[PDB]
Design an enzyme around this catalytic site. Structure first.
Site, PDB file in Angstrom:
ATOM      1  N   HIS A  45       8.085   3.263  -5.621  1.00  0.00           N
ATOM      2  CA  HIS A  45       7.100   2.864  -6.620  1.00  0.00           C
ATOM      3  C   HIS A  45       5.768   3.569  -6.453  1.00  0.00           C
ATOM      4  O   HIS A  45       5.007   3.838  -7.400  1.00  0.00           O
ATOM      5  CB  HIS A  45       6.935   1.340  -6.607  1.00  0.00           C
ATOM      6  CG  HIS A  45       6.230   0.806  -7.812  1.00  0.00           C
ATOM      7  ND1 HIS A  45       5.458  -0.335  -7.782  1.00  0.00           N
ATOM      8  CD2 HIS A  45       6.186   1.268  -9.079  1.00  0.00           C
ATOM      9  CE1 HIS A  45       4.951  -0.550  -8.995  1.00  0.00           C
ATOM     10  NE2 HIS A  45       5.383   0.408  -9.798  1.00  0.00           N
ATOM     11  N   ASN A  61     -10.067   5.688   9.860  1.00  0.00           N
ATOM     12  CA  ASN A  61     -11.115   5.300   8.923  1.00  0.00           C
ATOM     13  C   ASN A  61     -11.037   6.221   7.711  1.00  0.00           C
ATOM     14  O   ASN A  61     -11.237   7.424   7.839  1.00  0.00           O
ATOM     15  CB  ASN A  61     -12.501   5.419   9.580  1.00  0.00           C
ATOM     16  CG  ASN A  61     -13.576   4.825   8.673  1.00  0.00           C
ATOM     17  OD1 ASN A  61     -13.602   5.120   7.481  1.00  0.00           O
ATOM     18  ND2 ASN A  61     -14.481   4.027   9.253  1.00  0.00           N
ATOM     19  N   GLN A  64     -14.442   8.325   6.886  1.00  0.00           N
ATOM     20  CA  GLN A  64     -15.206   9.172   7.810  1.00  0.00           C
ATOM     21  C   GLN A  64     -14.334   9.954   8.772  1.00  0.00           C
ATOM     22  O   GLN A  64     -13.160   9.630   8.957  1.00  0.00           O
ATOM     23  CB  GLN A  64     -16.274   8.372   8.482  1.00  0.00           C
ATOM     24  CG  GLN A  64     -15.979   7.448   9.635  1.00  0.00           C
ATOM     25  CD  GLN A  64     -17.118   6.446   9.757  1.00  0.00           C
ATOM     26  OE1 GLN A  64     -16.987   5.389  10.354  1.00  0.00           O
ATOM     27  NE2 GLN A  64     -18.274   6.747   9.163  1.00  0.00           N
ATOM     28  N   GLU A  69      -7.341  13.515  12.520  1.00  0.00           N
ATOM     29  CA  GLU A  69      -6.456  13.608  11.358  1.00  0.00           C
ATOM     30  C   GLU A  69      -5.804  14.958  11.149  1.00  0.00           C
ATOM     31  O   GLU A  69      -6.335  16.038  11.470  1.00  0.00           O
ATOM     32  CB  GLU A  69      -7.266  13.292  10.080  1.00  0.00           C
ATOM     33  CG  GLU A  69      -8.142  12.064  10.028  1.00  0.00           C
ATOM     34  CD  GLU A  69      -9.569  12.207  10.536  1.00  0.00           C
ATOM     35  OE1 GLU A  69      -9.828  13.040  11.435  1.00  0.00           O
ATOM     36  OE2 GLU A  69     -10.446  11.478  10.043  1.00  0.00           O
ATOM     37  N   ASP A  93      13.651   0.330  -3.490  1.00  0.00           N
ATOM     38  CA  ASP A  93      12.260   0.806  -3.492  1.00  0.00           C
ATOM     39  C   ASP A  93      11.974   1.580  -2.216  1.00  0.00           C
ATOM     40  O   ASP A  93      11.395   1.100  -1.252  1.00  0.00           O
ATOM     41  CB  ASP A  93      11.284  -0.395  -3.654  1.00  0.00           C
ATOM     42  CG  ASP A  93       9.873   0.083  -3.966  1.00  0.00           C
ATOM     43  OD1 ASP A  93       9.762   1.308  -4.244  1.00  0.00           O
ATOM     44  OD2 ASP A  93       8.922  -0.746  -3.977  1.00  0.00           O
ATOM     45  N   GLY A 186      -1.966  -1.239  -2.327  1.00  0.00           N
ATOM     46  CA  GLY A 186      -2.399  -0.169  -1.432  1.00  0.00           C
ATOM     47  C   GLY A 186      -1.716  -0.223  -0.063  1.00  0.00           C
ATOM     48  O   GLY A 186      -1.843   0.714   0.728  1.00  0.00           O
ATOM     49  N   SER A 188       1.566  -1.061  -0.064  1.00  0.00           N
ATOM     50  CA  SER A 188       2.891  -0.574  -0.409  1.00  0.00           C
ATOM     51  C   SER A 188       3.303   0.740   0.231  1.00  0.00           C
ATOM     52  O   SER A 188       2.480   1.623   0.345  1.00  0.00           O
ATOM     53  CB  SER A 188       3.078  -0.237  -1.906  1.00  0.00           C
ATOM     54  OG  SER A 188       3.068  -1.615  -2.490  1.00  0.00           O
ATOM     55  N   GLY A 189       4.610   0.846   0.549  1.00  0.00           N
ATOM     56  CA  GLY A 189       5.076   2.069   1.194  1.00  0.00           C
ATOM     57  C   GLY A 189       4.956   2.060   2.701  1.00  0.00           C
ATOM     58  O   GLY A 189       5.616   2.859   3.406  1.00  0.00           O
TER      59      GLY A 189
HETATM   60  C1  LIG Z   1       2.020  -2.578  -2.876  1.00  0.00           C
HETATM   61  O1  LIG Z   1       0.913  -2.132  -2.603  1.00  0.00           O
HETATM   62  C2  LIG Z   1       2.321  -3.821  -3.664  1.00  0.00           C
HETATM   63  C3  LIG Z   1       1.741  -4.998  -2.920  1.00  0.00           C
HETATM   64  C4  LIG Z   1       2.142  -5.006  -1.451  1.00  0.00           C
HETATM   65  C5  LIG Z   1       1.841  -3.672  -5.047  1.00  0.00           C
HETATM   66  C6  LIG Z   1       2.299  -2.450  -5.764  1.00  0.00           C
HETATM   67  N1  LIG Z   1       2.007  -1.169  -5.174  1.00  0.00           N
HETATM   68  S1  LIG Z   1       0.603  -0.403  -5.487  1.00  0.00           S
HETATM   69  O2  LIG Z   1      -0.316  -1.339  -5.989  1.00  0.00           O
HETATM   70  O3  LIG Z   1       0.191   0.315  -4.309  1.00  0.00           O
HETATM   71  C7  LIG Z   1       1.141   0.892  -6.544  1.00  0.00           C
HETATM   72  C8  LIG Z   1       1.097   2.194  -6.076  1.00  0.00           C
HETATM   73  C9  LIG Z   1       1.522   3.248  -6.880  1.00  0.00           C
HETATM   74  C10 LIG Z   1       2.000   2.992  -8.149  1.00  0.00           C
HETATM   75  N2  LIG Z   1       2.492   4.072  -9.073  1.00  0.00           N
HETATM   76  O4  LIG Z   1       2.452   5.219  -8.612  1.00  0.00           O
HETATM   77  O5  LIG Z   1       2.873   3.653 -10.185  1.00  0.00           O
HETATM   78  C11 LIG Z   1       2.031   1.688  -8.577  1.00  0.00           C
HETATM   79  C12 LIG Z   1       1.616   0.619  -7.815  1.00  0.00           C
HETATM   80  C13 LIG Z   1       2.190  -4.851  -5.904  1.00  0.00           C
HETATM   81  O6  LIG Z   1       3.271  -5.413  -5.709  1.00  0.00           O
HETATM   82  O7  LIG Z   1       1.377  -5.205  -6.785  1.00  0.00           O
HETATM   83 CA   LIG Z   2     -10.776   9.419   8.802  1.00  0.00          CA
END
Ligand SMILES: *C(=O)[C@@H](CC)[C@@H](CNS(=O)(=O)c1ccc([N+](=O)[O-])cc1)C(=O)O
Ligand SMILES: [Ca+2]
Length: 240
Positions: A45, A61, A64, A69, A93, A186, A188-189
């Site tokens: 996703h 961070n 900064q 990195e 997913d 954010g 997610s993944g």
């Molecule tokens: C993940 O962060 C989950 C909550 C844990 C949410 C959905 N992901 S997101 O908000 O990071 C996201 C990233 C990228 C896309 N995209 O490329 O379409 C969409 C959503 C959630 O479940 O709301």
């Molecule tokens: Ca940094």
């Protein structure tokens, strides 16, 4: 991560930040787990938008210089062939990202240890979610990597009517649900790291939370179960 604490700098060296190009800069959009020097595991996703992506390893961070990195482009994106953006509840997913260059391993950059295929955690198993996701429902991303203790919630409980019902599948891991601590947009993944036989292993890829908000009682954060896709992962890596 809502209700988290700042992670120590070298605690979770397989955590990465997946970012997309925005004008003359880069923006964090999701986590991921480094699983080979040139491969990262993340959610399908997270790459549904046709954007330019990069991976940052050794990050702590986001706003900064940490002096640790490494920045690398994404050369190939392999999404699970059964993934459907219209049905995140269907599962699948998960996506693998081949990096343009192999990163260098060190105390801030390490491969994530994956569970053996088919492994399922007992209810209430000790796990930590990590990430730079929102620190509150409708909040803002974290500057520094956060961690939160989220004990698992097994399938029988998680798919019960007062929790997630039919929305959760046996191909997912649920964790948390206390109404205080959770993943959030954010995160997610990224990884769900769980302690098993003395070693932390990445058992989940963060996938979703309730539409009602991140930290909602009896709506634990839901993750793709890594141990259901070990063959798929190895098949992709080997044929690429
Ligand atoms: C993940 O962060 C989950 C909550 C844990 C949410 C959905 N992901 S997101 O908000 O990071 C996201 C990233 C990228 C896309 N995209 O490329 O379409 C969409 C959503 C959630 O479940 O709301
Ligand atoms: Ca940094």
């Amino acid at each position: 991560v809502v209700g988290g604490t700042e992670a120590q700098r070298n605690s979770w060296p397989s955590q990465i930040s997946l970012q997309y190009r925005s004008g003359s800069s880069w923006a964090h959009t999701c986590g991921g787990t480094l699983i080979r020097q040139n491969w990262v595991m993340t959610a399908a996703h997270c790459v549904d938008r046709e954007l330019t992506f990069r991976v940052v390893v050794g990050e702590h961070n986001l706003n900064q210089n940490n002096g640790t990195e490494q920045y690398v482009g994404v050369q190939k994106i392999v999404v699970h062939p059964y993934w459907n953006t219209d049905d995140v509840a269907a599962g699948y997913d998960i996506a693998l990202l081949r990096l343009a260059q192999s990163v260098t391993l060190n105390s801030y950059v390490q491969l994530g240890v994956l569970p053996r295929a088919g492994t399922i955690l007992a209810n209430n198993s000790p796990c930590y979610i990590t990430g730079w996701g929102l620190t509150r429902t409708n909040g803002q991303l974290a500057q520094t990597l956060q961690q939160a203790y989220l004990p698992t919630v097994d399938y029988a409980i998680c798919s019960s009517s007062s929790y997630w019902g039919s929305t959760v599948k046996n191909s997912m891991v649920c964790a948390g649900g206390d109404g205080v601590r959770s993943g959030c947009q954010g995160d997610s993944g990224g990884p769900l790291h769980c302690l098993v036989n003395g070693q932390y292993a990445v058992h989940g890829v963060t996938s979703f939370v309730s539409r009602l908000g991140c930290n909602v009682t009896r709506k634990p954060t839901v993750f793709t179960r890594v141990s259901a896709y070990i063959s798929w992962i190895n098949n992709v890596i080997a044929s690429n």
